[PDB]
């Protein structure tokens, strides 16, 4: 019944969205004078992005435009279809607010139409997992309202711990001895980015991230994301799966919009606690 829409910052694999009937509106990357798509056959990849960033290219990102949500929303209302939009955190992008404005314009044309927008206060794998729980609820025949309620319950309980090389691109992007120091960050209850530890070295950074992620597990699945290093993510995966509470691990490469902000060698772990973080 209801359609599920998300955005390219949820970092869902194309194969998953195709097979799961989830649509994705692309944010853009501005990279050395050109605007790249982040969805479609011509989408910019993180591998290409990070390569350019290593040679000194300072790429910036842009929100989804009101027009994109307009078209999608209007097409759905025209077709008698309900819509759930699992949205990239409102505190990191004006994407959510543009969708809200687009919904306003469409409800003018289609006053009885059904369009729910969830401000996940999330990012990348976290956001993606929320969409995955939303596609699972849809399978189980939950309504749009019930699915909205599920995501609004789960979202505040999602933990996001992420380990970076430094704060350079994070501070450069506007959303935020140091030799061999790996900062560890999280998203607080407001969805704000907040350093919580500075580890001497990647092995310690990972250990700490694993410890914090596994402090409070109330759900059998964890998510690991990585910028560059797929073997490092595998090591996180194995460790996670060694918790009796963790039965599954979803592993997702970071997409280029997120990668533009966090930088290379980023690792992240997403888990769901019993209570709201």
Ligand X SMILES: CCCCCCCCCCCCCCCC(=O)O
Enumerate binding residues for ligand X (CB under 6 A).
27, 61-63, 92-95, 123-124, 160, 162, 173, 175, 187, 193, 225, 254, 257-258, 261-262, 266, 268
Q: How far is the CB of 31 from ligand X (least distance, A)?
A: 13
State which residue, 115 or 269, has the beta carbon closest to ligand X.
269
Q: How far is the CB of 190 from ligand X (least distance, A)?
A: 13
State which residue, 49 or 268, has the beta carbon closest to ligand X.
268
Rounded CA gap, 131 and 191, in Å?
A: 17
Rounded CA gap, 154 and 144, in Å?
A: 15
User: Contact at 8 Å (CB) between 250 and 11?
Assistant: no
Helices 202-213 and 230-241: crossing angle, nearest 10°? 40
Contacts of 163 by beta carbon, 8 Å cutoff, 6+ apart: 182, 183, 184, 185, 199, 202, 205, 206, 208, 209, 266, 267, 268
State which residue, 50 or 258, has the beta carbon closest to ligand X.
258
User: Contact at 8 Å (CB) between 64 and 24?
Assistant: no
State which residue, 69 or 162, has the beta carbon closest to ligand X.
162
The 10 Å Cβ neighbour count of residue 152 is: 14
Q: How far is the CB of 93 from ligand X (least distance, A)?
A: 3
Q: How far is the CB of 261 from ligand X (least distance, A)?
A: 4
State which residue, 123 or 246, has the beta carbon closest to ligand X.
123
Q: How far is the CB of 256 from ligand X (least distance, A)?
A: 10
Q: How far is the CB of 173 from ligand X (least distance, A)?
A: 6
State which residue, 22 or 263, has the beta carbon closest to ligand X.
263
Contacts of 171 by beta carbon, 8 Å cutoff, 6+ apart: none
Contacts of 257 by beta carbon, 8 Å cutoff, 6+ apart: 8, 9, 27, 29, 38, 61
State which residue, 137 or 249, has the beta carbon closest to ligand X.
249
Using CA atoms, how far residue 251 sits from 56, 72, 225, in Å, is 28, 29, 6
Q: How far is the CB of 161 from ligand X (least distance, A)?
A: 8
Q: DSSP readout, 129-164?
A: HHHHHHHHHHHTT--HHHHHHHHHHHGGGEEEEEE-
């Amino acid at each position: 019944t209801f359609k599920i829409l998300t955005d390219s910052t949820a970092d869902l694999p194309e194969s998953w969205t195709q097979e799961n009937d989830v649509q994705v509106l692309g944010l853009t990357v501005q990279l050395d004078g050109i605007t790249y798509e982040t969805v479609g056959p011509d989408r910019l990849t993180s591998r290409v992005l990070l390569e350019k960033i290593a040679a000194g290219s300072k790429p910036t990102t842009s929100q989804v435009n009101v027009g994109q949500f307009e078209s999608y929303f209007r097409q759905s209302a025209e077709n008698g279809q309900e819509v759930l939009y699992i949205a990239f955190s409102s505190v990191l992008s004006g994407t959510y607010q543009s969708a809200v404005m687009a919904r306003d314009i469409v409800l003018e044309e289609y006053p009885q139409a059904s369009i729910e927008i969830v401000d996940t206060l999330a990012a990348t794998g976290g956001e993606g997992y929320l969409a995955m729980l939303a596609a699972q609820a849809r399978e189980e025949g939950k309504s749009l309202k019930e699915t909205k309620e599920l995501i609004l319950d789960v979202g505040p309980r999602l933990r996001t711990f992420f380990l970076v090389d430094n704060l350079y691109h994070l501070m450069r992007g506007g959303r935020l001895s140091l030799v061999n120091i790996k900062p560890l960050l999280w998203l607080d209850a407001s969805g704000k980015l907040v350093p919580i530890a500075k580890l001497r070295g990647r092995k310690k950074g990972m250990k700490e991230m694993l410890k914090r992620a596994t402090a409070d597990v109330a759900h059998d699945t964890a998510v690991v994301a990585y910028a560059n290093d797929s073997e490092a993510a595998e090591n996180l995966k194995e460790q996670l799966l060694a918790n009796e509470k963790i039965k599954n691990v979803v592993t997702l490469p970071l997409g280029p919009v997120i990668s533009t902000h966090v930088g290379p060698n980023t690792l992240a772990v997403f888990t769901i606690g019993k209570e709201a973080r």
